[PDB]
Amino acid sequence: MEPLYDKNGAVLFGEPSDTHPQSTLKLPHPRGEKEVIVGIRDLPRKGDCRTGNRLGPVSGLFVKPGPVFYQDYSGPVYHRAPLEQFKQAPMCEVTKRIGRVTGSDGNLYHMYVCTDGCILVKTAKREGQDVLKWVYNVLDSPIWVTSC
Ligand SMILES: [Cl-]
């Protein structure tokens, strides 16, 4: 199973791994002043990092299936997409491009929200060429997609 990380950046089980250098998640980075849910129409911006915004503090963008988006989050999170909980699927009609996420396989993925509310990833380059949807979330925890 892909590990979770606490807001001090320590692995809560298993062994820790680094993010792909080209991921939109840049570590180390603070987070977890507050858990702040946001709507997809109110996804945060880069310049919210220091000030926060109207809705509260901002460490970046987090997402889990539902879809549920957060601009900050205090509990355990994934730093890489837990691919054991994804399944192969055709490209969807995408509604939003949300960042570049490291897969639990070490590869870079483009991450999208689909019209059907699914979170989908597509491999960024190389032999890979894979499209997968996030279908299970047994630890009910988001991916940290981007850090501000
Ligand atoms: Cl997993």
Side-chain angles (χ1 to χ4, degrees):
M1 301 179 72
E2 178 68 16
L4 292 170
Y5 295 81
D6 61 41
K7 82 195 180 185
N8 288 321
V11 94
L12 284 168
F13 55 99
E15 310 157 14
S17 275
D18 305 291
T19 50
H20 190 294
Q22 306 313 113
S23 179
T24 43
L25 176 56
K26 306 303 189 190
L27 299 172
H29 198 291
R31 69 170 177 85
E33 194 170 306
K34 299 198 200 307
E35 175 181 290
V36 182
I37 292 153
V38 292
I40 199 179
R41 296 180 153 174
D42 253 75
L43 291 187
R45 45 195 69 187
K46 296 177 176 195
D48 298 341
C49 211
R50 198 149 296 184
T51 48
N53 56 28
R54 224 81 266 285
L55 303 172
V58 180
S59 51
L61 178 71
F62 304 76
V63 75
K64 67 188 193 171
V68 189
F69 306 91
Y70 313 77
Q71 64 176 40
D72 197 13
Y73 192 90
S74 280
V77 304
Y78 291 110
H79 297 170
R80 316 190 299 171
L83 296 175
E84 288 171 357
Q85 293 194 97
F86 286 62
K87 298 280 278 175
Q88 198 168 243
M91 174 57 41
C92 67
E93 296 291 311
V94 333
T95 296
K96 197 152 291 199
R97 300 177 35 248
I98 57 160
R100 300 181 296 284
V101 302
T102 316
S104 51
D105 57 4
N107 294 315
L108 194 74
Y109 292 80
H110 292 289
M111 181 171 271
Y112 304 113
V113 185
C114 300
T115 56
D116 69 4
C118 301
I119 311 304
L120 175 148
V121 297
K122 185 169 183 149
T123 58
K125 202 93 288 178
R126 273 84 208 179
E127 287 97 341
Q129 189 80 134
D130 273 319
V131 176
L132 304 126
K133 288 191 169 189
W134 196 351
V135 306
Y136 299 119
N137 193 13
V138 297
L139 304 182
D140 187 23
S141 299
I143 302 165
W144 195 354
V145 180
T146 67
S147 53
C148 49

